[PDB]
Amino acid sequence: SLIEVKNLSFNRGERVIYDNISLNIRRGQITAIMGPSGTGKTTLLRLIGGQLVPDQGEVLLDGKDIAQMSRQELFAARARMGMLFQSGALFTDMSVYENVAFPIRAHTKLSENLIAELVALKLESVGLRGTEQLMPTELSGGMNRRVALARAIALDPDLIMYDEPFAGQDPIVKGVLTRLIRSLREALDLTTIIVSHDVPETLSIADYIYVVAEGKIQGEGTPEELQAYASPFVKQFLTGSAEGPVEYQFSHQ
Amino acid sequence: SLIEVKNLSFNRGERVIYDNISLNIRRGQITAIMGPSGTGKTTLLRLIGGQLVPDQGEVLLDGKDIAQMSRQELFAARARMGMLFQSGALFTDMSVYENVAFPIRAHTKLSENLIAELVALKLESVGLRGTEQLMPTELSGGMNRRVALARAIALDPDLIMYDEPFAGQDPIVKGVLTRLIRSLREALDLTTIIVSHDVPETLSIADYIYVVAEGKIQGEGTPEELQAYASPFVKQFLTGSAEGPVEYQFSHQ
Amino acid sequence: TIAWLGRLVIERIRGIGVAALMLLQIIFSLPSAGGFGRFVYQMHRVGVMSLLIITVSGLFIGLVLGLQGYSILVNVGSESMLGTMVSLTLLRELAPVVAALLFAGRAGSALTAEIGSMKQSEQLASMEMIGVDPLKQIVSPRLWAGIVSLPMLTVIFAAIGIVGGKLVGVDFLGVDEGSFWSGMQNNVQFGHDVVNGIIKSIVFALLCTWIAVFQGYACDPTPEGIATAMTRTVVYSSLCVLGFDFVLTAVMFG
Amino acid sequence: TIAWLGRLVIERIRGIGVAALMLLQIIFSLPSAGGFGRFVYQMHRVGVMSLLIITVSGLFIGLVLGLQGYSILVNVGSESMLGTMVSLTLLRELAPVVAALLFAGRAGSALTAEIGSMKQSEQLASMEMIGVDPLKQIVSPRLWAGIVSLPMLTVIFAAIGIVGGKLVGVDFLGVDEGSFWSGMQNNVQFGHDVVNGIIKSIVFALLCTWIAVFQGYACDPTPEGIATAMTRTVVYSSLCVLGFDFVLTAVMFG
Amino acid sequence: ELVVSGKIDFENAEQQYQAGLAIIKKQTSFPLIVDLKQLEHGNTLALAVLVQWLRQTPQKSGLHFKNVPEKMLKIIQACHLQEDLHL
Ligand SMILES: Nc1ncnc2c1ncn2[C@@H]1O[C@H](COP(=O)(O)OP(=O)(O)NP(=O)(O)O)[C@@H](O)[C@H]1O
Ligand SMILES: Nc1ncnc2c1ncn2[C@@H]1O[C@H](COP(=O)(O)OP(=O)(O)NP(=O)(O)O)[C@@H](O)[C@H]1O
């Protein structure tokens, strides 16, 4: 799926978060978004996903305007994507079986026997075959997050979004998630979006990167191009360098 | 001064967090601790001679056992430490001026004129001159950390502990915190402790590093030396490789 | 300076408008009967888990009414009056208020906290993309458990209060079982001393639970807000129960 | 299976022992070491901020008692009883209970959340690292501000309630005023019944605030812990007030 | 000329502070030059005292950068308190 985002504008109450963002989410590629903390990275994914109302913006799924879709078109469209949220978004009241199985009931009418087999396959694909029937609250950190991902890929969606996957602190986990993204990207022909922090980990994964700050695109390119055209904002941002366009209060008498 | 911890053992919640830890904190040097999350990093710092009581072992400051020896000395001795706990604490009911001023009142009896001047100097040392009358709750995240640090160095302490300062942030901030540490270790002749998950930053800052996991020290050295002794645990940990002594849960059938 | 109050009032009242709109949607359209088979589960945390508190309070209230009634009524007619006053007090004013407030506390703050977390963790939000409307899946069975549970608890509170009253008023303090029971029958009418207790209970059950759901489902995703929401659900349903209790009793027995 | 309950009971009672120990450590009058400006300030949040809620509640309770008393008294034909009963009901049983439950209640919940937040946030840990014992800064003025505030609010509640009672009982419903004031004097007194109302509120103030402090402060830092603690304070505060109300009223007027 | 020498600690900050104020009360212009190398090192509050002293006569450029101890100038430079105080 190719997703067009044009002239995006969005305010949260009176505050402007975005101001005419223009994105091309390229088919079969990994795209990524980087930027300063708190500049609406998650807001942008929510708008792309159609869960927020854009202000005069245009969002197209395979060329179709989401604002013009009928209830059935929208409902069916939901089965085209899955997302992994920043906290993991697991349901505490259900065991792992239901947490992964759950979205299947939104679109299909299957026998319990086939539902169970899909759950088993999806858990195996991420190394969770042995967690069956345990409550999610009893999982260790790495396992907890892997379950949530299993839900996102449960329906064989075209698009997977990862919201802050590299914010995990454990070097071991960073290793595993990097591998899962690459593994799943190939196995399922996925288009993916990585929205994160700590640059040493998105610059080696994405095929194409946008740098976003203060509601504007600050530059775009492949990792190489961003360095080549690294406007000072971008340059210091990607470098993690001091003495960029960063201010603090100062005057003396 | 030098701090020594020997044969440390500590059991919390019926589980042992630490088992015969032996540390040598070198004077004037940066000592750092790395390891998997959830393994006692905060706890070990607290057991340096804070509010936690070990089951076995000793804590020595200047070679003296702090346990029992004596009340008045210990009260005064406490003036030699400053810390940033996790996210960093600010008191919400106090202005920035008061948060920095606060520890002064624990050990001194000064005129309003001098307490005010010390606050002004300490805020400038971290780039916060002129923000004294704002309530801390109105600060951006980058400033919350800097205010808390100004408090930590308010009394001209000898030991500064940074509890997970690099764990999760903005690359701009990482640049600033790194610089503040470099500036202050020299300006104030400090001994510092950096405890952090983000291995790539720790490796270029510390003079000496301990790798701690599962309650034991699993290797020690300057960063150059740790790279020379590839115990499978330490090697995977310091490289981010997903392969090594870690687990996944599966068995086909 | 002064305009601050102005803004506070304006926004709080806007919020009531929102609450009204939310209530309309949850009650107005609920076609997903297949998933409502679970509300019986939900009831576990509203009704089943609250009997211990309602029962213990009902006993203490009954015993207190017994002792105070008696020390006043020995000068007027305990033989006839313990029966009539214990039963009318519990049926008309206390079961509908004491149970309503204990409930607002124990079930109310717990429920709002739970919705609050569902929102704060972003867990709830993830359902929108799965096509499962959270109002029909998360909110519906919670509001209904509240409606059924409080009225049944209200009756139990009174049942225990009667045991309490008799236990001291008749059995330890020297009064006739005969006139206690007949006195109650002579003055307590099903229509409408028992019935009005139930009507007030339904009104409170809806109002009180409605508020707990509404505040838990808060706008602002800040951790500080959970504690604020919990305090507010207790305060607002508490005043609303007392305000509406006044008007309803004024009509029912005026 | 069964042992689960057993473990729960054992841990809750152990916790009581800890709470008792904490109360002993805090109660010694040690806070004089610092200024008390902090106390005056703290009183703002526990007392002054709650006057609106307790006042509105007192007015509705007064008006309700007025209407219920009247619709019973018209069947005795003895209207002088409005004075005697509005006063005794509020002074002996309702001001000490309604005020205690609305108080903690709101102040109870908010205080629990605030101290607990300071534990979760690491603010308290920092203070010990600095060298200022947190019990003398964070806990002390909160426990005492609660002790002074509730008893004072109890009085206001009753005062509003009596006035509300007269407002309907005498002024809208046609009762000769002289019998109202005389009925109050005949025979409830300032030197006895008012005094017992206050004593009960001192006891309740300690139970409510003591629990609220304990629940916030004394807990290992589990992230879900704040919401649970807030609910727990409301439940324990409430049962303790009713359990003690029974034993005290049983003596004061027995 | 008149130098408040020795160690400025927190405990005696008040008296060292007043001694300097007495020197200022007996004001000169150019302000008297103080040899700060007569002070014990490692005390930031010594600076707080010195700053307040200069600020009692803020209109006067009473700067003596040459007499500043190396440790004192290092904290000044590290903290952006550097000003052209050369003479
Ligand atoms: N209804 C609402 N009213 C007010 N604020 C809201 C509402 N819903 C969500 N929030 C806003 O949601 C925004 C989300 O974007 P953001 O603050 O940048 O977080 P984020 O993307 O996870 N940050 P980061 O992890 O650095 O990328 C916040 O700024 C909140 O104010
Ligand atoms: N006071 C306490 N009493 C009992 N259990 C606690 C207490 N505090 C926290 N917990 C547990 O004890 C440990 C707290 O310290 P610690 O392991 O050092 O955290 P940490 O490693 O810094 N956490 P993190 O920053 O996420 O990696 C964890 O294992 C908690 O589950």
Author numbering:
A (entry chain K), B (entry chain L): 11 to 263
C (entry chain B), D (entry chain A): 3 to 256
E (entry chain C): 8 to 94
Can you list sentences taken from the study reporting this PDB entry?
In order to improve the resolution of this structure, we collected a dataset of the same complex, in the presence of the non-hydrolizable ATP analogue App-NHp, using a state-of-the-art Titan Krios instrument. Using this better and larger dataset, we were able to refine the structure to ~3.9 Å resolution. The transmembrane multiprotein complex features a 6-fold symmetric assembly of MlaD, with the C-terminal helix forming a basket in the periplasmic space, and the N-terminal helix spanning the inner membrane. Intriguingly, while MlaE was predicted to have 6 TM helices, we observe that TM1 does not traverse the membrane, but is monotropically embedded in the inner leaflet, a feature similar to the G5G8 human sterol exporter, suggesting similar mechanisms between these complexes, and further supporting the MLA system as a lipid exporter. MlaF is bound to MlaB away from the nucleotide binding site, similar to the recently reported E. coli MlaBF structure, with the C-termini of MlaF binding the opposing MlaB subunit by a handshake mode. In the cryo-EM-derived map of MlaBDEFab, we observed well-defined density in the pocket formed between the MlaE TM1 and two MlaD helices, within the inner leaflet of the lipid bilayer, which could not be interpreted by protein atoms. We also observed that this pocket is coated by cationic residues, mainly Arg14, Arg47 and Arg234 of MlaE, forming a charged pocket that might attract a lipid head group. As the sample was solubilized in DDM, this density is most likely occupied by the maltoside ring, with the flexible hydrophobic chains extending up into an apolar region of MlaE. Accordingly, we observed clear density of the nucleotide and magnesium, within the MlaF binding pocket. The resolution was sufficient to map the phosphate binding regions like Walker-A motif around Lys55 of MlaF, as well as binding of the γ-phosphate by Ser51 and His211 (H-loop).
The maintenance of lipid asymmetry (MLA) protein complex is one of the core machineries that transport lipids from/to the outer membrane in gram-negative bacteria. Here, we report the cryo-EM maps of the core MLA complex, MlaBDEF, from the pathogen A. baumannii, in the apo-, ATP- and ADP-bound states, revealing multiple lipid binding sites in the cytosolic and periplasmic side of the complex. The complex has a global C2 symmetry, with six copies of MlaD that span the inner membrane from the periplasmic space to the cytosol, two copies of MlaE embedded in the membrane (yellow/gold), two copies of the ATPase MlaF in the cytosol (green), each bound to a copy of MlaB (blue/cyan).
